[PDB]
Design a protein around this ligand. Structure first.
Ligand SMILES: O=c1ccn([C@@H]2O[C@H](COP(=O)(O)OP(=O)(O)O[C@H]3O[C@H](CO)[C@@H](O)[C@H](O)[C@H]3O)[C@@H](O)[C@H]2O)c(=O)[nH]1
Ligand SMILES: Nc1nc2c(ncn2[C@@H]2O[C@H](COP(=O)(O)OP(=O)(O)O)[C@@H](O)[C@H]2O)c(=O)[nH]1
Ligand SMILES: [Mg+2]
Ligand SMILES: [Mn+2]
Lengths: 542, 179
């Protein structure tokens, strides 16, 4: 079905005044929508958006118009019409499972997590996306952070021994070296990248590590070829050979995260979007596990002691302890419970003969060609699991949110970076730029992106969320619901958001690997890490 | 409909602002970890016959964000000034850092003094490791006295883990915003 007819709106919006040109446009757009016989949902949505924009133009020019009454009601209709198109006709997603591991050799833990998915869903293609030119990025990051750690320890030699030493002073001091070294690498890269014998990222990294960090070339090449071999044997697919990057702007974003910042999670954020766009299907983080059978442990009642989150962890720990589907999976929390429950579990688990009787199959995940589903945690969105049809409008919206936020970040950050000051002074200039550009529309965003340079190297630096992560997804959701673009801080109500939830029964998020982020850490981990640094620095090594 | 009101939470780092916001907004306390989700806190509440939508703004209490905190302050309707019961140092900073900053940036905005982590006042480990630094947990009279000294609208204790007093905290903040 469609909206109200052209003549119906004329009727409903009758005035003494003659028809203003904006109103003629409104009627034309509404008609064109009604007369539209296109089975393409994107075309329908775009026509609706055009209509909505025309209405807005009218209601903003003639704010006192008597037509505003009806033009407001039609707007309420248009929203209802959006959902109507989304919910009406769904098909299953392309049966692709997308994973990303970039920057080095994929570990066996990740492979085992992927193995679970692939075993349960033998009909789905597994795509482990990697960058064939960037196997040494993690090595370079490791080298930079270790050099910086030693430099900061030696600097505060006289102080780190004091038990009342603030660890933040260590991390702040180290950041200065980290930034210096990042600049040095980037300047070298920028000089090397334009040689006639067009060098790869790995070539430049190798050269830089050999020159500046006393690394062995042969060892580095060995590691690189090993990484390539290992990933190619486990569903590996190269982003550089499948043309995921058509826009230079997206490649620039990806590269700035992969090279300038050494944030592999941010690079992953870009790649997953491009993959879901070009191919479609399901994206999963390497710390995500398939959903547990919906009522496999309903015979076992949760004790009053343990909360829900931990309860679920124990479930996983139990499964891994009696099935050994994944090597070296923890049992810490599972060990801390009485044999009454412990034994009970074992019976239920070992009773089942097939893996399918423990974990859930994805089978057909029915979605609309407009939408993208996202995982939920703490009643908010998180892009660790995604479902999207190829060329979905919403995915393109998210990609647009990312480009937009990177445009604003780079515009405000580039002058400071280029000033070639130390970390503090560059931060000062960047913050000044942010401060100067502050409005009541974007202030919360500026607060979030403020420690962008510190992400990965200092605790509580989680800017990635507001650039390439969940923040962009939430804004794109709001963008879509209200037929908008480039929304910054507007958010939806829960009822409107649950519409895009990743089915709970098809995902296990409380895995051992998830609780330890690979791109950020908190202050407690920073404290523990600093104490370990001091212990190992003072004790010596053999 | 509903009345829109802005709440901003301030206080020392680690005193439990984030967990409190999450507990109130989503009725969930993170027992294990805090996932890297999109941070947005909005809550509907009915107080004194009215229905109010509270926009909860979190802040970083650390000095690193001293110069950025003020971007969150404009158009604030109510401030939750927080301290942790298990951190006397946290309470001592209320009038050293937070009161002048809140006065300078949010003139005439009511302040609710919130003493967080109520469940640690009687905790054994807490008392033990506080005795080493020759300290003891904060008494309610200590907090009440501080509310009167700073001219706060009210004082309330809560425990985000047990959800004890959380509703009362936000209800009191709402009453302060409506006044
Ligand atoms: O060296 C690395 C490190 C990370 N990754 C990728 O980035 C992921 C991030 O996973 P994780 O370390 O668990 O990040 P989270 O802490 O779980 O953060 C969540 O919120 C962030 C907001 O951007 C996202 O980027 C994450 O995808 C999202 O799951 C991994 O799955 C990989 O895909 C790599 O490819 N190479
Ligand atoms: N015992 C107890 N611990 C808490 C409570 N609220 C928070 N915590 C812990 O204190 C830490 C700091 O909490 P957070 O909300 O991040 O404080 P913030 O630094 O002000 O954002 C968290 O890791 C919590 O586990 C509480 O009510 N009781
Ligand atoms: Mg916090
Ligand atoms: Mn994760």
């Amino acid at each position: 079905m469609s909206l109200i007819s052209k003549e119906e709106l004329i009727k409903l919006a009758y005035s003494i005044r003659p028809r203003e040109n904006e109103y003629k446009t409104i009627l034309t757009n509404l008609d064109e929508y009604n007369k539209l016989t296109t089975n393409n949902n994107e075309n329908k949505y775009l026509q609706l958006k055009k209509l909505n924009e025309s209405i807005d133009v009218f209601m903003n020019k003639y704010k006192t118009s008597s037509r505003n009454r009806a033009l407001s009601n039609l707007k309420k209709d248009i929203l209802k019409e959006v959902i109507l198109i989304k919910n009406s006709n769904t098909s299953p997603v392309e049966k692709n499972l997308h994973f990303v591991w970039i920057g080095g050799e994929v570990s066996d833990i990740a492979l085992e997590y992927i193995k679970q998915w692939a075993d349960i869903n033998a009909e789905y293609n597994i795509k482990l996306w990697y960058d064939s030119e960037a196997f040494l990025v993690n090595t370079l990051k490791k080298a930079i952070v270790e050099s910086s750690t030693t430099e900061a320890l030696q600097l505060l030699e006289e102080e780190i021994q004091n038990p009342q030493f603030d660890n933040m002073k260590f991390y702040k001091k180290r950041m200065e070296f980290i930034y210096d070294r990042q600049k040095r690498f980037i300047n070298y890269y920028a000089s090397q990248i334009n040689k006639p014998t067009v060098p790869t990222i790995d070539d430049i990294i190798k050269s830089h590590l050999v020159s500046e960090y006393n690394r062995d070339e042969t060892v580095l090449e060995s590691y690189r070829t090993n990484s390539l071999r290992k990933i190619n044997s486990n569903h590996g697919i190269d982003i550089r050979a499948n043309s995921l990057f058509t826009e230079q702007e997206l490649l620039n974003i990806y590269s700035q995260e992969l090279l300038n910042r050494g944030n592999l999670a941010a690079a992953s954020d870009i790649v997953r979007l491009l993959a879901l766009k070009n191919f479609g299907g399901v994206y999963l983080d390497v710390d995500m596990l398939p959903g547990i059978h919906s009522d496999l442990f309903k015979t076992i009642s949760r004790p009053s002691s343990i909360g829900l989150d931990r309860w679920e962890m124990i479930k996983l720990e139990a499964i891994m302890k009696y099935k050994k589907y994944i090597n070296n999976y923890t049992s810490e929390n599972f060990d801390k419970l009485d044999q009454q429950l412990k034994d009970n579990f074992k019976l239920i688990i070992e009773s089942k003969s097939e893996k399918s009787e423990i974990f859930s199959k994805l089978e057909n995940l029915n979605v609309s060609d407009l939408e993208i589903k996202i995982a939920f945690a703490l009643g908010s969105v998180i892009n660790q699991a995604l479902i999207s049809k190829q060329g979905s409008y919403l995915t393109n919206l998210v990609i647009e949110q990312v480009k937009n936020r990177y445009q604003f970040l780079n515009q405000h950050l580039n002058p400071a970076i280029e000033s070639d000051n130390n970390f503090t002074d560059t931060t000062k200039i960047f913050h000044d730029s942010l401060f100067n550009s502050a409005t009541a529309e974007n202030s919360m965003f500026l607060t979030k992106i403020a420690p962008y340079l510190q992400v990965g190297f200092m605790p509580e630096a989680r800017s990635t969320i507001s650039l390439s992560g969940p923040g962009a997804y939430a804004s794109a959701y709001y963008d879509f619901i209200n037929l908008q673009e480039n929304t910054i801080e507007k958010t939806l109500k829960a009822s409107d958001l649950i519409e895009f939830k990743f089915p709970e029964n098809n995902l296990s998020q409380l895995t051992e690997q998830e609780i330890n982020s690979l791109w950020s850490f908190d202050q407690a981990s920073a404290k523990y890490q600093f104490e370990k640094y001091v212990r190992d620095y003072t004790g010596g090594s053999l | 409909a509903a009345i829109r009101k802005k709440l901003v939470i301030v206080g020392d780092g680690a005193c439990g602002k984030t967990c409190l916001l999450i507990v109130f907004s989503k009725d969930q306390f993170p027992e294990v970890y805090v996932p890297n989700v999109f941070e947005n806190y909005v809550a509907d509440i009915e107080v004194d016959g009215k229905q109010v939508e509270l926009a909860l703004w979190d802040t970083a209490g650390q000095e690193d964000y001293d110069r950025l905190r003020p971007l969150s302050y404009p158009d604030t309707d109510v401030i939750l000034m927080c301290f942790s019961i298990d951190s006397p140092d946290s309470l001592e900073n209320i009038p050293e850092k937070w009161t002048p900053e809140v006065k300078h940036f949010c003139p005439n905005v009511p302040i609710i003094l919130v003493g967080n982590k109520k469940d640690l006042r009687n905790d054994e480990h807490t008392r033990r490791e506080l005795a080493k630094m020759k300290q003891e947990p904060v008494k309610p009279e200590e907090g009440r006295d501080m509310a009167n000294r700073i001219g706060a609208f009210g004082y309330m204790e809560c425990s985000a883990k047990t959800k004890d007093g959380v509703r009362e905290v936000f209800e009191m903040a709402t009453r302060a915003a409506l006044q």
